[PDB]
Structures are given as C-alpha cells and as structure tokens.
Amino acid sequence: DKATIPSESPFAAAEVADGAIVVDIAKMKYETPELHVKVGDTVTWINREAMPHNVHFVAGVLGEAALKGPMMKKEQAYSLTFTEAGTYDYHCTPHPFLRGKVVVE
Ligand SMILES: [Cl-]
Ligand SMILES: [Cu+2]
Numbered sequence: 137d138k139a140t141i142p143s144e145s146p147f148a149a150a151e152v153a154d155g156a157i158v159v160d161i162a163k164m165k166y167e168t169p170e171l172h173v174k175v176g177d178t179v180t181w182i183n184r185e186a187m188p189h190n191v192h193f194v195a196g197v198l199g200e201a202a203l204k205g206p207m208m209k210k211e212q213a214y215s216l217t218f219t220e221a222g223t224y225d226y227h228c229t230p231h232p233f234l235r236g237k238v239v240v241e
C-alpha cells in the first residue's frame with residue numbers, strides 16, 4: 137500500500153502536537169484541500185464540528201482496497217502516513233462533495 141495507519145480508531149485532537157501536519161475539517165471543507173507533503177510524512181485530520189466526517193480513499197488510490205477511515209466526532213482526529221510519492225484524492229463517505237487531495241513528493 138501507499139500509506140499506513142498509526143491508529144485504527146479516532147483519537148482526541150488535544151493529543152496532536154503543534155506543528156504536526158494538520159488538515160482541519162469545518163463548514164463542510166477540508167481547510168487544506170490540496171496538501172503537499174513528503175514521503176514519510178504523517179498527516180492528521182481533525183474534525184472541528186459536530187457533524188461527523190471521515191476520509192475515504194477509493195480502491196486503487198492507496199492500494200487495491202479502499203481505505204475508508206473511521207467517522208470522527210467533534211475534536212477527534214485521525215492520521216495517515218504516506219509512504220510513497222504520488223497524488224491521492226479522497227472524500228468524506230457520506231458527503232462525497234467534501235473532497236481533498238494529498239500530493240506526496
Ligand atoms: Cl466499496
Ligand atoms: Cu463529512
């Protein structure tokens with residue numbers, strides 16, 4: 137696969153370090169819709185609102201299987217580490233028009 141999962145379940149956003157690579161979700165937007173990172177970088181999504189959100193990479197994107205992330209409640213977070221250069225689109229399962237992209241060089 138082209139990424140690994142530090143934590144299979146969501147965790148408390150307060151645990152994320154300042155200066156960690158963070159994508160906020162709010163007002164039905166990934167606050168950084170095209171994120172540029174390097175191989176080995178760990179990306180953390182944080183849900184800032186009461187509507188639950190996830191990140192969903194369809195089959196083909198990070199491997200032959202889809203990576204459907206767990207639903208994050210308000211102030212919950214979820215990380216992925218990108219291990220291979222490429223460009224990876226994702227969306228939120230229940231809200232397919234909430235979408236983003238990670239560019240890994
Ligand atoms: Cl499916
Ligand atoms: Cu959503």
Ligand SMILES: [Zn+2]
Nearest residue numbers: 187188230231
């Ligand atoms: Zn809904």
